[PDB]
Design a protein around this ligand. Sequence first.
Ligand SMILES: O=C(c1ccncc1)c1ccc(OCCN2CCCC2)cc1
Ligand SMILES: [Yb+3]
Ligand SMILES: [Zn+2]
Length: 605
Amino acid sequence: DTCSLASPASVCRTKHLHLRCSVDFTRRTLTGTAALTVQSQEDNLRSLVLDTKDLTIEKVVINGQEVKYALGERQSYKGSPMEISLPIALSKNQEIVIEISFETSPKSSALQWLTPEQTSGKEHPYLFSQCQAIHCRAILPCQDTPSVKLTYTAEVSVPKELVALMSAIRDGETPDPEDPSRKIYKFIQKVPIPCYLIALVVGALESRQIGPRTLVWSEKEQVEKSAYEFSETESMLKIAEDLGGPYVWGQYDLLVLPPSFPYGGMENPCLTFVTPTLLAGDKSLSNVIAHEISHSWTGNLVTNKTWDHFWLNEGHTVYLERHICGRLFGEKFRHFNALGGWGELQNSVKTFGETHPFTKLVVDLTDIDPDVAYSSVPYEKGFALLFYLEQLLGGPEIFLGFLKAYVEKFSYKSITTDDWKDFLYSYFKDKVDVLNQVDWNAWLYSPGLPPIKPNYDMTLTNACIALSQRWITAKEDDLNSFNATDLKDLSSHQLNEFLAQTLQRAPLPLGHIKRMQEVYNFNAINNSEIRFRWLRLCIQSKWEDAIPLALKMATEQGRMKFTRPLFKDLAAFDKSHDQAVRTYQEHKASMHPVTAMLVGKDLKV
Ligand SMILES: O=C(c1ccncc1)c1ccc(OCCN2CCCC2)cc1
Ligand SMILES: [Yb+3]
Ligand SMILES: [Zn+2]
C-alpha cells in the first residue's frame, strides 16, 4: 500500500478500535483515546508503525504503562508516520491493546466544522467526517489502508442538545458523567471494515422512518423533503439483496448533510451520507442511492486492497446500481444510463488527455494524492469493462451469477485486480476461450478510452441526440422553430442527456443559448444535474447573465462534481475570471478542506 506509512498487514493487523472521544466545538478538536487491538503477523515483533496526519499525541499506553513512540517528518498528504516501541516482543498471532491519547487539528483534512450560520437551523454548529480515501489518519492514528479490516466500538461526548451518529449500530446514550452539559453516544460496528469506512456526524439532527430498516437523518428543515425523495430505499435494498445476497449490516440509514458535503454519497456502513443536492422534489437523482446501497456488497464486503484497485469498488457498484435502475424502470433505461456513462468517460479522457496515467483503469498511486487522481474513470471505465464482459459471456442473467458468486467468494476480504481476474477465469472456466479474446493489458493498464465499445440500446437516447443536433446545426434563421413543445416527451433524464450531448460540443453561439433560455426557460429548473450542465453551457458559450447564477451554485453547495468545474469554467471566461478567484478567496476559509485545496489548485492560487 503505497498511500500508507503504517506497518503492512504482513507485519501486524488491527482487529478492533475502541474510540472514546469528545467533540469540542470551541476549539474545533476531537480529543480522546483510540485503543487498537493489534495482532502480530510475525515472530519477535518489537516495533509497529501507524499512519497519522496533523495529530497531537499526548501519550501511548500498553499494559497500564507509558511507552516510547516517535513521529517521523511529514510526507505531505500522507502525513507523519508514528513508530511505537512495544514493551514486550510479540509472537506470531499474539494480540495486544495499544491505547493512544490524541487530539485532532482544526485543519484535519477528514473533517469539516460548521458555524451555526452554515447550517439550516442557524442555532447550532455541526461536524462531519469524510475518511475516504486516506483521511482516517487525520482523525486517529491507524493503519490507514483498506488492506486491513477491523471492528470498532465508540463513545462520543457532545453538547447535550446535539446528536452524534456513526457508521455503526446505535448502542444507547447517557449524560456525560464528567460534564452535565454533555451526552455520551455509544456505537458498535460488529462487521469488520476497512478504516476508510469510519464516519461521524454531530449536529442538531432529527430522524423520520421511511422503511422497515431505514430512518432518514438531517436537520429539522430537510427531513420532510428527504423522506419523500428517498422513499424507494427499501425497495432498492430488496432488489440489491436479490442481486448480491443478504444485507449483513443490520440497518440502512441515510444522513442528509449540509450542502458542503463534497460527494454525491459516501457508503458509510449502516449510515450512508448523501448530498442535499439529491433533493430534486421528484426522486430523479435516486441512481445515487442505488449506488450507495450497492456498496454494501461491492467495496464494503469485498474491498479494494489498495487504492490502485479502486475500480473494483466503483466498477462493480455502478454495474449493480444500473441493474437496480434496470429492474425498477426497465432494460432500455439501464442501456440509457450505461451509454450516458460512456459519454461521461469521453469527457474525463478528453479533460485529462488520452495518454494521462489517471485514465488507466488500474493506476499507480505512488506519490499521488488520491484526491488529485479522483474522477469518473474508475467508475465508467470499470463499468464499461463489466458491461463488455456481460455481452461477451452471454448476458445480464449470466454475468449476475458471477457477480453474486464473486461477492460470496471475497466477502470480508480485501482484493487486487488479479484476485478479481483469477476468480473471473475460474467461474467462467468453460469460457476461457472467450475470455482470452479480451485485450487485458489494454483494458487494465493502457490510458485512454477502452479499446472496444459495448453495444447499447439507443431507444431512449435518440430523441436527445436528435434535439441536440438540431441546436448545433441550426443557423440564425432556424432559431425561430425551437419551441417549448420540443421538451414535451422528455423525462428529466433525457433533458439532462440533451444538455450533456450539447455541452460536449460547447461553445455554441450566444444567440442559440439566449434562444434556448427564451423557449425552454432552463433558468427555472432546480434539478441540480440539469442546472449544472445548463450553467456550464451558458458560461462556455460566453453568456454574461449566467455569471452570477453560476457563482451562486458554485458556492451555495459544494458537491465537487459541480463546484469544481463551475469554478474552472468561470475562471476560463475572461469576464468572470476575476470574480471567480475573488469569490474563491472569500469563501476558502469556510469550505471543506479537500474541496478548498482542489479548487485552489484548479484555479492556480
Ligand atoms: O484511489 C483512488 C483512485 C482515483 C482514480 N483512479 C483510481 C483510483 C481514490 C481517490 C480518491 C478517493 O476519495 C474518496 C472520496 N469519495 C467519497 C465518496 C465518493 C468518492 C477514493 C479513491
Ligand atoms: Yb520467537
Ligand atoms: Zn462509489
